[PDB]
Design a protein around this ligand. Structure first.
Ligand SMILES: [Mg+2]
Ligand SMILES: [Mg+2]
Ligand SMILES: [Mg+2]
Ligand SMILES: [Mg+2]
Ligand SMILES: [Mg+2]
Ligand SMILES: [Mg+2]
Ligand SMILES: [Mg+2]
Ligand SMILES: [Mg+2]
Ligand SMILES: [Mg+2]
Ligand SMILES: [Mg+2]
Ligand SMILES: [Mg+2]
Ligand SMILES: [Mg+2]
Ligand SMILES: [Mg+2]
Ligand SMILES: [Mg+2]
Ligand SMILES: [Mg+2]
Ligand SMILES: [Mg+2]
Ligand SMILES: [Mg+2]
Ligand SMILES: [Mg+2]
Ligand SMILES: [Mg+2]
Ligand SMILES: [Mg+2]
Ligand SMILES: [Mg+2]
Ligand SMILES: [Mg+2]
Ligand SMILES: [Mg+2]
Ligand SMILES: [Mg+2]
Ligand SMILES: [Mg+2]
Ligand SMILES: [Mg+2]
Ligand SMILES: [Mg+2]
Ligand SMILES: [Mg+2]
Ligand SMILES: [Mg+2]
Ligand SMILES: [Mg+2]
Ligand SMILES: [Mg+2]
Ligand SMILES: [Mg+2]
Lengths: 82, 122, 129, 80, 205, 156
RNA sequence: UAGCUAGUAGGUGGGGUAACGGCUCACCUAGGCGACGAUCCCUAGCUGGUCUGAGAGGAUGACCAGCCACACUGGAACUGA
RNA sequence: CCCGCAGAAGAAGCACCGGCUAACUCCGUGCCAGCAGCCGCGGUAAUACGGAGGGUGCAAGCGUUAAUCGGAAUUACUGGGCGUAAAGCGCACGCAGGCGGUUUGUUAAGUCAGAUGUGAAAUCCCCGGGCUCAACCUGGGAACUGCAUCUGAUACUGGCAAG
């Protein structure tokens, strides 16, 4: 089904995840419906590092989209921080 | 020239043939020396230029120059050929590579050693 | 056959300027008159005069300044063998804006600058320098 | 308002069917000349109403045969 | 990756003094600065347009100690940047960290400054920077770290620098051994003998 | 202040009963850096003499050129028999992007920012002749205003 | 390489498909494609892009991503959304 | 990534130097041996072969070969030509095709204008940010010159009607 999950991008030892809506069958970095954010796990202080378009995510979930565990965690973090 | 004419029959790109077609767009190719001989240069030159007619791995029978002073070549001697003509042997389009398979490096060379397959002296 | 009357007119103007002719006459048409009017407005010719009823003749009075021709160059651009139309962003600047380009727009025949100001392209008739 | 194309009837022999050239006056990619290009289409026409040489308006539809995916909507300039 | 050969040799070839020696002793005393290096120095052949351009480029490269690939990259970057290309190139070269260290005076030559930078003697904004090509930015403090603060070479270099002409685009504290890179120098601020235009033409053949 | 530079020096021969007579031709170009440029073609049995003759010729018969802020006034083409030349004004800082002969002529003329190309033959003397002709013909906006009987502001 | 095509082109009616359809079958009509290149022959996975070039172009389609086709060679279906 | 230890210690080659093209001399050979991208060089004073010294250019690379575009306006749409350089059919008629004097009306096909939709992400470019710097990664823009639909304008070209 449609899911919301991290797509690994960046360099070796320096991952940068693009949060994408995509049909689960597709490969991790392959075909995707919509790109709804990003997450930078090695991002330093005085840098944003995370950004999730929450409205779009809400819309897709409403449509019936599953969410990756990591993406769910990110959402929780965003809510707390904000 | 007339726009109508061009539309009717457009402009042909000038298909340039290669001058080293035995390579077949390869940088080098291996072959076996069918025959090793000397030949006379063209009208502004006098020499006995060393050359070997070689059957390549891909079938072609070419003629190849052998640069450097002296060589350890004879019939049934596996060599690598490269691109380059001898302007003054007519119809010779390929050089042997000194410092490859059966071909030895030039003896006692101290300059352009990389061009003649000679290892660095002490 | 005569296949391009505008071109013929332009050629006549060029030849007159070359030959120091005071005026140049040719069969009048509405398009020709419009082009002539544009030319007068921009000041590349002194005057035009349409004369006759059944088959009227346009008579242009050519312009000289220091013994030499005012219209340095005058080339047809769009032509029957090859029509040229441009959009407002593609309108040409002749001689880096010094010369004018006669453009036939939806709102009548006008110079390139005028056409650009209006905001519409059209058939590029000719360049004049 | 529906999408529709006009064209001259190039043939009307095959029964309930006509062939409709849809000449378009395109510009040449390179040379810039405007060339007349043609588009033959097998159009379905029930009642065999169309003649040859007839101008006819057509719309696209679900395929009715191997070659026939257009239907006529109205005939115009149907003189002989 | 570095030129390790004779320096006055390079200077003689160029014609000018490239500041490859500390400047304690005059270059006229250290070498025949007028005569070019080698068997055929006592001869000045008439130089082609290409030749003159090449010589100027070589001069600049020798002055800073940049090899060709890096220099070419610098030129491309300058060309990309807005404004005058030669001017931009000069600014970038000046911006280099080894160069700034030399200007401040934490080294008699750029070779010495480069050595210090490589050997981790120099902190940029309180952070040990190791790369000689590091572009220093405006308002950047650059300082000798304490272990290198005891160096007699550093203090001698400071003395020599005091003798030299001070740069307008830096502000340096000799006791603190720290200098603030206030702004990238303008072309009027850099030396007039450099004809950047030749370099631009050469890399835009 | 009359900057001059020699474009090309070429050896030419004449044949006589004895044998060949060689001589040298020098194509030079002088200009004041404010608009005035002039080329000269001198011939003598030796090169320095030839150059001097060329220089004198160039210094005389110069020609004025309408320069707009150290650049061309509009894109201009120029021909002289084989040499057909194109040269286009360019933004400040572009430099002279111009061939050999062409570069020399432009530089002495005083154009600091140009984009040129020499089509056709690139025979130095003809190419220089073509460039000078093109530069000469190139009119300014004040000139166009005068011709058309308008203000310069109406034309822009 | 100038002619090619008899399920061929269209119709009616049955059958078939998840679905329109000569997809298939029976009959009827004699059509259909073609110098805007049909047919035949050679070569080739296509695209975003890549290299080059001032541009217009030219060449190209490794890597990364979208689409397609194949799975020793030739056929076939079954199961199943 | 940081700290400490010892000691200049373990770390420079490749091509070229007649012109184009930055860099020249001596010796050896003597149209030989050989070189060469082009033009050319060598037949007993070789800056062109081979060695040496000196120099030039790149540098952990440097040359050679292959391949593409460029220069090449040398397929010329932008942007060529055809008296003698390659190029006017031996001459005509004529179907398809290309082009069409002049006026008014009409249409709105070409043309032009505006909007809407799309033109995946990456890539290219601009301003930023993160790896000590760079490469590299990355945020946001711009661009994707296109295509489609709707609504207009009607000067020009096309269609239609009368002249
Ligand atoms: Mg051929
Ligand atoms: Mg000879
Ligand atoms: Mg490196
Ligand atoms: Mg049925
Ligand atoms: Mg049924
Ligand atoms: Mg294949
Ligand atoms: Mg394939
Ligand atoms: Mg070009
Ligand atoms: Mg593969
Ligand atoms: Mg399959
Ligand atoms: Mg299979
Ligand atoms: Mg297998
Ligand atoms: Mg099988
Ligand atoms: Mg199942
Ligand atoms: Mg099943
Ligand atoms: Mg030289
Ligand atoms: Mg050699
Ligand atoms: Mg001897
Ligand atoms: Mg000797
Ligand atoms: Mg040589
Ligand atoms: Mg030698
Ligand atoms: Mg070309
Ligand atoms: Mg020609
Ligand atoms: Mg002839
Ligand atoms: Mg004839
Ligand atoms: Mg008409
Ligand atoms: Mg017609
Ligand atoms: Mg329309
Ligand atoms: Mg994109
Ligand atoms: Mg940064
Ligand atoms: Mg109309
Ligand atoms: Mg009309």
């Amino acid at each position: 089904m449609v899911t919301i999950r991290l797509a690994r991008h960046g360099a070796k030892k320096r991952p940068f995840y693009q949060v994408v809506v995509a049909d689960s069958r597709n490969a991790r970095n392959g075909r995707f419906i919509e790109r709804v954010g990003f997450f930078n796990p090695i991002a330093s202080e005085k840098e944003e590092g995370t950004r999730l378009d929450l409205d779009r995510i809400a819309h897709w979930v409403g449509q019936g989209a599953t969410i990756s565990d990591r993406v769910a965690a990110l959402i929780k973090e965003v809510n707390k921080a904000a | 020239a007339t726009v109508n004419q061009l539309v009717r029959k457009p402009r042909a790109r000038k298909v340039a043939k290669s001058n080293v077609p035995a390579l077949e767009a390869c940088p080098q190719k291996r072959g076996v020396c069918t025959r090793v001989y000397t030949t006379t240069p063209k009208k502004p030159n006098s020499a006995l230029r060393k050359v070997c007619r070689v059957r390549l791995t891909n079938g072609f029978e070419v003629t190849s120059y052998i640069g450097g002073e002296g060589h350890n070549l004879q019939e049934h001697s596996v060599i690598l050929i490269r691109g380059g003509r001898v302007k003054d042997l007519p119809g010779v389009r390929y050089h042997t590579v000194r410092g490859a398979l059966d071909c030895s490096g030039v003896k006692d060379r101290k300059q352009a050693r990389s061009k003649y397959g000679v290892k660095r002296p002490k | 056959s005569m296949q391009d009357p505008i071109a013929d007119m332009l050629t006549r103007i060029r030849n007159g300027q070359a030959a120091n002719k005071a005026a140049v006459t040719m069969p009048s048409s509405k398009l020709k008159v419009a082009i002539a009017n544009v030319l007068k407005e921009e000041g590349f010719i002194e005057d035009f005069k349409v004369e006759g009823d059944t088959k009227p003749e346009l008579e242009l009075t050519l312009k000289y300044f220091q013994g030499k021709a005012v219209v340095e160059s005058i080339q047809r651009v769009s032509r029957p063998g090859l029509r040229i139309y441009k959009r407002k962003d593609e309108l040409p600047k002749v001689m880096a804006g010094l010369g004018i380009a006669v453009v036939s727009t939806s709102k009548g025949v006008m110079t390139d600058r005028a056409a650009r100001q209006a905001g519409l392209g059209g058939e590029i008739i000719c360049y004049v320098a | 308002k529906i999408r529709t194309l006009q064209g001259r009837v190039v043939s009307d022999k095959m029964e309930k069917s006509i062939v409709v050239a849809i000449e378009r006056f395109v510009k040449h990619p390179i040379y810039g000349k405007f060339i007349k290009r043609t588009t033959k289409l097998h159009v379905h026409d029930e009642n065999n109403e169309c003649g040859i040489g007839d101008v006819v308006e057509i719309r696209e539809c679900r395929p009715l045969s191997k070659t026939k995916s257009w239907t006529l909507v109205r005939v115009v300039e149907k003189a002989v | 990756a570095r030129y390790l050969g004779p320096k006055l040799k390079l200077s003689r070839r160029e014609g000018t003094d490239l500041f490859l020696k500390s400047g304690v002793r005059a270059i006229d005393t250290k070498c025949k600065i007028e005569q070019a290096p080698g068997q055929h120095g006592a001869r000045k052949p008439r130089l082609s347009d290409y030749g003159v351009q090449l010589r100027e480029k070589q001069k600049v490269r020798r002055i800073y100690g940049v090899l060709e690939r890096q220099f070419r990259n610098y030129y491309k970057e300058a060309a990309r940047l807005k404004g005058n290309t030669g001017e931009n190139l000069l600014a970038l070269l000046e911006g280099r960290l080894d160069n700034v260290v030399y200007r401040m005076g934490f080294g008699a030559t750029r070779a010495e400054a480069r050595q210090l930078v490589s050997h981790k003697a120099i902190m940029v904004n309180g952070r040990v920077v190791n790369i000689a090509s590091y572009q220093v930015s405006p308002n950047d403090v650059v300082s000798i770290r304490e272990k290198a603060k005891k160096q007699s070479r550093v203090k001698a270099a400071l003395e020599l620098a005091e003798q030299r002409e001070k740069p307008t685009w830096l502000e340096v504290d000799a006791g603190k051994m720290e200098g603030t890179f206030k702004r990238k120098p303008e072309r009027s601020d850099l030396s007039a003998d450099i004809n950047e235009h030749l370099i631009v033409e050469l890399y835009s053949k | 202040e009359l900057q001059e530079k020699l474009i090309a020096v070429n050896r030419v021969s004449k044949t006589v009963k004895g044998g060949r007579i060689f001589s040298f031709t020098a194509l030079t170009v002088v200009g004041d850096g404010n608009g005035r440029v002039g080329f000269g073609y001198g011939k003598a049995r030796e090169v320095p003499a030839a150059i001097q003759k060329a220089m004198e010729k160039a210094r005389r018969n110069m020609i004025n050129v309408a320069l707009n802020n150290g650049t061309l006034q509009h894109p201009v083409k120029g021909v002289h028999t084989g040499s057909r030349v194109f040269m286009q004004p360019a933004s400040e800082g572009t430099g002279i992007i111009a061939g050999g002969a062409m570069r020399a002529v432009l530089e002495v003329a005083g154009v600091h920012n140009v984009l040129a190309k020499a089509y056709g033959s690139t025979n130095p003397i003809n190419v220089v002749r073509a460039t000078i002709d093109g530069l000469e013909n190139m009119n300014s906006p004040a000139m166009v205003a005068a011709k058309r009987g308008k203000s310069v502001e109406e034309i822009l």
